[model samples]
Target: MADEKPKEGVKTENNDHINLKVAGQDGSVVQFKIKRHTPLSKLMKAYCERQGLSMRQIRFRFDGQPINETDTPAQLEMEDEDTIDVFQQQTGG
Candidate 1:
């Protein structure tokens, strides 16, 4: 599958900081920052769905990592500034 591309006005990082907010209902906002190499579309999609929100609500990095649904905060915290790739997990046929 093709990965998501960057939308306009989103900043590109050549080793930079990015602020991410998972904006859900009830004004709940989960805020964090990360640096990564690819668009985080799939990760955000799954997270929002699990929380009963539609697919377009989370705002991740512009060219951030493609985090899998299974990734945790600890796993994400292990990423160093130099890491350059994020892989997608396969589900069904």
Candidate 2:
């Protein structure tokens, strides 16, 4: 142990890095490392870019609950290692 107190953004007792696994629509999975305070939109945007998709093309969920773009790890009470399911958004009624 470093025996050092946790900082504000980098690392803290309750705001440390959150390792999340995002399951893609095609049975693929991607891992992301984000801070507790960081908005989930950051991860979603990155995933979209990496997969050559658009923000409006994806939807995220956790434990059968829809995850908003503004929701953060700490706000969602997510564990250190959590899994988020990603799906393709449907359009046109």
Candidate 3:
């Protein structure tokens, strides 16, 4: 797989590899290539790990609705270049 080129919207037996974008609070965008059948939590967890944050500290939104950890790209009807917004979960004192 290392030697194979990454294909856009590639479909496999159990999953489809699709490109997606996520925007941070600063409006910075991060691109990800992932399987459509995988849970959104995979992306959240990876982002949290890279930023040294916890999964509970962040929230993801797509199409103006909150995305749950169990949501998958295929289930959400996400397409290429579709953007997911990442926000820091607000806490009340």
* Per-residue alpha-carbon lDDT of candidate 1 for residues 1-93, written as tens digits (9 for 90 to 100): 124445555665567445455544445544445544433344466445565554333333323654444554344544432222322232445
Model 2: lowest-lDDT 10 consecutive positions = 1-10
lDDT of each: 0.44, 0.77, 0.76
Q: Give the candidate number with the greatest lDDT.
A: 2
**Model 1 clash tally, residue pairs:** 1
Clash pairs (backbone) in predicted model 1: 38-64
Q: Please give, for residues 1-93, the per-residue lDDT of candidate 2 as tens digits.
A: 455544454764554778877778887777787788888778877777887777677788887887878778787788766788888886755
Q: Mind sharing the TM-score for model 1? A: 0.31
The list of candidate 1 runs beyond 4 A from truth reads 1-14, 56-93
TM-score of each: 0.31, 0.73, 0.72
* Angstrom error at residue 63, model 3: 1.3
The C-alpha RMSD in Å for every predicted model, in order, reads 14.3, 5.8, 5.1
Against the true structure, whose TM-score is highest? 2
Q: At residue 57, what lDDT does model 2 achieve?
A: 77
Candidate 3: stretches off by over 4 Å: 1-15
Tens digit per residue, CA lDDT, model 3, 1-93: 535545646654545778788877867677777888877678767776776666677788998889888788898788877898889885654
